[PDB]
Design a binder for this molecule. Sequence first.
Ligand SMILES: *[C@@H]1O[C@H](CO)[C@@H](O)[C@H](O)[C@H]1NC(C)=O
Ligand SMILES: *[C@@H]1O[C@H](CO)[C@@H](O)[C@H](O)[C@H]1NC(C)=O
Length: 130
Amino acid sequence: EASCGSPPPILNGRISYYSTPIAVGTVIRYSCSGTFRLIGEKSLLCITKDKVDGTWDKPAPKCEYFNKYSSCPEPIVPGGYKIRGSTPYRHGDSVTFACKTNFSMNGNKSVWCQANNMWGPTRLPTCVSI
Ligand SMILES: *[C@@H]1O[C@H](CO)[C@@H](O)[C@H](O)[C@H]1NC(C)=O
Ligand SMILES: *[C@@H]1O[C@H](CO)[C@@H](O)[C@H](O)[C@H]1NC(C)=O
């Protein structure tokens, strides 16, 4: 059966338990110590596109040293709406979006407020009328 290689490591962070070989369907969780903030989706899933090679479904998140002064402006996604997240958006805070009725999403539904005062680590999702 297809399997995944070692999960992407994380500076100043930890990964939850995983057995080897890593079977397709395996999920691992990332976390950071108290003085750091996890940026990006915390859970990775081992998938396979061709049933021969296994690959993780997304890049690993990262741990950023807490910057207490950082804040992000209200993120806006045309055709979509915020379903989770409250202002003010400080370092490590996240917002989740859903597309309006008759719109379909492309991209990650959640973004995080980074130390550089920008939303990331990915672009905000796009909601397209279908
Ligand atoms: C972002 O979302 C896309 C589309 O769902 C996915 O393919 C990609 O792996 C995600 N990346 C991260 C860092 O979450
Ligand atoms: C949204 O409405 C349009 C027009 O009726 C239609 O083409 C599309 O399939 C609808 N989307 C969903 C998810 O029902």
